[PDB]
Every structure is written in structure tokens, then in C-alpha cells.
Amino acid sequence: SGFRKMAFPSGKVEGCMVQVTCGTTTLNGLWLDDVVYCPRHVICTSEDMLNPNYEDLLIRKSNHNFLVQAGNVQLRVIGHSMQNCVLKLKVDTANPKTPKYKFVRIQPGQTFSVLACYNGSPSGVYQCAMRPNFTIKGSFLNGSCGSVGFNIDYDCVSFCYMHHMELPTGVHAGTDLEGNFYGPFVDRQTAQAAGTDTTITVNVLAWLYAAVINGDRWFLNRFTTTLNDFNLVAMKYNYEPLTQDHVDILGPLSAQTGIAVLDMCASLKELLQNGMNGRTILGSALLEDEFTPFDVVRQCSGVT
Amino acid sequence: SGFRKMAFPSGKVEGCMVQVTCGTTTLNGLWLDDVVYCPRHVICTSEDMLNPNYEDLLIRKSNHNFLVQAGNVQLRVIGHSMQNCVLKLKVDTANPKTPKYKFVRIQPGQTFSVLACYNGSPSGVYQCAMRPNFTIKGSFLNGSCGSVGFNIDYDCVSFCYMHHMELPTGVHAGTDLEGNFYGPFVDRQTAQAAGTDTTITVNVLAWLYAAVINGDRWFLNRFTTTLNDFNLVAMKYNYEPLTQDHVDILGPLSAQTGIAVLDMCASLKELLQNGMNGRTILGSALLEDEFTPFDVVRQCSGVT
Ligand SMILES: *CC(=O)N1CCC(C(=O)N2CCCCC2)CC1
Ligand SMILES: *CC(=O)N1CCC(C(=O)N2CCCCC2)CC1
């Protein structure tokens, strides 16, 4: 028993972190096979900043301007290309610690672990969600750019995120490993405001299931609801609309706990309309929305 | 910016996790040099359970009854001894991945990362505190015993915790790596109730500092207080008494933010007396107490 916000073991990804220095800029790169991936803004300076023309900036860069260091050993850069907002530095040595890996573009509501790094050295690991507004609520200081977000399926790391941008509101933006930003965000120091940070309804329900499974049951009530009725209450409270797909996704948790999804929706509805009344659910005073149904099943079953 | 509940990178510790099987019991061991550490209850059965005499139970065990498996390779057990509530299995091979390590007995309020494992395979990593009642609020299913809690100081892992017991209230108990339980707890299926789960006052303050440092400032007020006045309010709310040592420990954070510790105490006092009024601090609706002052400094500075 016990339910905890749990990151994947970072080992496989620690073995992929290098330092990338271009000029006076130092940040993090991912080393997979003979390619190192980093944010293209590594090449930026004091001024370019507001409106860097990355293609033009890059013309002034050679292979030898990209200093790539794996612990205390330098990697030889034998090629460099720009793919969207990431650089791909070809090194002459394949990372011997390259795990099985995929690059996946996650959807909003999907969760992942982030290995926070500075100078290609891992500092910590935490669990995130891609927010419905395509931000993430991270922990990222200067030098943390190139830190990646990932999922592990047993021995295969699925990289979903590279850190690029802090918004003036102190939320975070970045790319998949093809260098495409999540959401409308750009690697440019400009007026970028996040949209509404909506709650991931399906995740709150998953977490309501995890709670029951671990003995926290006070919020179970006698009520049920429909999708349409529940979604009126979701709207008012800036919750993602709940779809039959979401109900379907909660099936297993429904099954195991013998609580119908729509009954749990009615439990969530009362929590929204009435608050927690100073009580807690799995040691939280608000409705957690960064556990997927998959995350709950994983942690409640004990998958490795 | 952003502040997140952050575990240490698990890599160094993943490389230390093996499976220990005695009879039909499978749980986790720590492999450091040529010794594997596991809970002594690995040798327990259906009945012993309520009052196992571990010395007597162990007489019926030989080296060859302890099956130790590192991934898909078996380790040869060449000796076994009981140290308090852990077993130390001598293997014929030193773990090639043994990091620099220490065994440290932590104090209540001290935080650590736990690598949740099943069958010597890491499932996840989360951050814990040793509670003032010597419990931890973990996530531990069957097979998770022998999972360890640790801190890293750069390249040196300080192991502080091995998982042994779930209390009927679904909180967790275990030992340091010398096999001594934190608190009054025993590896025996009996009436063990946790005492009052008090809040780690110094940690809440550290976290109040982390908040200010990351822009969450609404709870700053015009008030100050004394230790004695603040401690009357702490008592009433089951908070650890705050000592000058704690004030001293918060010095650096005081310095950096230019908020006197006693002013922040007065901020915490009003939060206790008035609640959050439906507001949040670093995306929490209650007062987080599993960040040390050291943890705040680390994450706010970016130590690796
Ligand atoms: C997120 C990260 O690590 N970054 C690298 C540093 C960079 C920065 O601070 N500057 C200032 C000096 C000129 C380049 C940009 C911000 C992004
Ligand atoms: C915490 C852990 O992993 N443990 C190992 C399993 C054990 C258990 O379930 N049993 C039942 C069968 C007889 C031995 C005890 C509990 C501790």
C-alpha cells in the first residue's frame, strides 16, 4: 500500500547525458548512438535572443565549435544539422550505454519522468505531465536546457521531451526529440503566455481509483452522473471534457475496485462543488491530475 | 524556476539491486562489494510470522538456500550472517557496479530517495522523509521489501533505509543498513501503531523559502514572532518544536531571500491559524514538510 508520485528509474537516461558548450553557452545533450541532441538555442548570444535567425546563426558554427563532454572525456563532432528546434551533433563514437529507445510525441495529459541535469550531470528526477496548454510544471535553472522527459517500457526508453524555454510565469516549454515544440511555443525571448491550465479529468479519476485501492474512501458518495451532466460541472471548473474513450481507459480500475466510472465521476463532481472540507486524499489537499490510468495500474500492480 | 519533489538519480542504486529468494519468499537485496543485504524476514513462512525466532529459523538455512540473482545471472552465496534485522549474504563476486557508498542512520525530518523494486528490478523512484514517528509514507507492494532509501553526495551514495514492514494503517517501517529499525518497530506481524505524525516545522519553512524564491509570495505578511510564541502555535497544530538550531539551519535561505526566519515563522503561524483559503503554494494546497533546508538550497542552486 501507499501511493507516491513516482519517476522511472533514471539509470538508462543518466548514461545518455553529456554537456554541450557552444561559445559561452553550456547546457545538456542527449547522446544516443553516434548522435548528440541539444536545443538549437545553444548557439544563441546576448542579442540574437529576441529574434535569432537560427539558419543564419548556424552558418557561423563549425563541428569544432560544439564542445561535447561525456563525464571527463570529450567527444569528436564529425557533423551537425538542425532538425526543427534541436541540433543533432554526429560524434565519431556511439554511446556504449545507449539503451533501447524510441522518440515519441506525447499528448496532453500523458505523464513522463524528467532527469534534471546541469553541465550534462544529473541532479534529480521528478514526474511531470504534458499540460493541456502544452506547458509542463518543471524545475529548471540555467544550464538545465537539454534535460529530457521519458517513459520506460521495461528496457525501451521512449524520449518525449527536451527542455528549452521558461515562460515569464515560471512554467516550462520544450520539444519532442524531432525538435517540434509542444504547443504554440518558440525558442525566442518574446511575449509567450500559456493558455488555461485545465485539469486532466481522466487522471484525477485514475487517482481517485488509486485512493480507494489504498484505503482513502471518504469521498465515495451515493450519487451517480452521466458524461453530459459531469461535463457541465467539468466546464465550470476548467476540467478537460470526459469522453467515452476516458471511461473505456478507466475500465480496468473500474473492474478491480467494482466502482463504476460514472459513480466515481459523481464523487469527483461533489469534490469539485464542495471542496475537500480540510480533508486529504492520498496526503494531497487538492485533486492530483499527473497520474495516468496506466500510471495507477503500474504502481498499484508493481510493474518493473 | 519551478520547484518539484525531486528524487536523486537512481542509476548508482539500480546497479546494486538483486533478487533474494529463500524458499517461496522473493524480495530485494542490495549488492555492495561481495555482500548482499536483505531483510531477515526473507526466511519467514506462513506461521512463524506472528512470533518468528529468527536465530532458530536461521539454523535451518544454508548458503545454498539463499538464491541471489543479478538480472539473469545467479550469485554464489559463500556465507550468511544476521546483523540485527538484516541478513548479509557473502557472494564470491564483488558487484562491479558498487558505487562509493556509506551506511548512515538518518534522523526524523531527514529526506531521502527510495528506489521501489520488485524481484530485484527497479520499478520507480520517489522522495521520502523519515517521519517524526519513525514511519515513512512510501509506496510498497509485496516483493518491494529490500528496496532502499538513499542520498547521493556527488558520487558517494549514503544508504539510510531498507524497507521491511507495512503497518495496518498503510504507513511503512524499516531499518538502516546495520538492520536497526527506525523507531520502536519490529519485523513481526503484531499490533504496531504509529505515534502522532507531526509536521517537520523546519522543512515547511525551507519550503516557504523555496516558494518565495520561485515567485509564490501571497502568504508573506507584516507580522513577526518569537520561537516561544511560534512554538505555542506549533504545539496546538502537532508541528515539531522549532529550535535555534533550525533557525541557524535556515540562515542561508534567510540570507538569499532577505526574509528573517522569525518573519517566515509568523507567515507559517498565520497559514496554520487561517488555512490557505483555497489558494496554493508551489501547486500544493497543504504545507509540504518533505523538503529539507539542504534540499531547497540544492534544487534552487542546481547541485549535481
Ligand atoms: C535553459 C538553459 O540551460 N539555457 C542555457 C543558458 C541560457 C542563458 O542563460 N543565456 C544567457 C547568456 C546568453 C545565452 C542565453 C538560457 C537557456
Ligand atoms: C515486503 C515484501 O516484499 N515481503 C515479502 C513477501 C511477504 C509475504 O507476502 N509473505 C506471505 C507468504 C509467507 C511469507 C510472508 C511480505 C514481505
UniProtKB/Swiss-Prot annotation, chains A, B:
Location(s) in or outside the cell: Host cytoplasm; Host Golgi apparatus; Host nucleus
Cytoplasmic topological intervals: 1-304
Domain of life: Viruses
Effect of residue 189 to A: Does not affect ability to cleave and inactivate human TRMT1
Residues in Peptidase C30 domain copies: 1-304
Catalytic function, reaction form: TSAVLQ-|-SGFRK-NH2 and SGVTFQ-|-GKFKK the two peptides corresponding to the two self-cleavage sites of the SARS 3C-like proteinase are the two most reactive peptide substrates. The enzyme exhibits a strong preference for substrates containing Gln at P1 position and Leu at P2 position
Cleavable signal peptide: none
Subunit structure of this chain's protein: 3CL-PRO exists as monomer and homodimer. Only the homodimer shows catalytic activity. Interacts with host FBXO22; this interaction promotes the proteasomal degradation of nsp5.
Protein name: 3C-like proteinase nsp5
Species of provenance: Severe acute respiratory syndrome coronavirus 2 (2019-nCoV)
UniProt gene name: rep
Complete-protein stretch covered: 3264 to 3567 of 7096
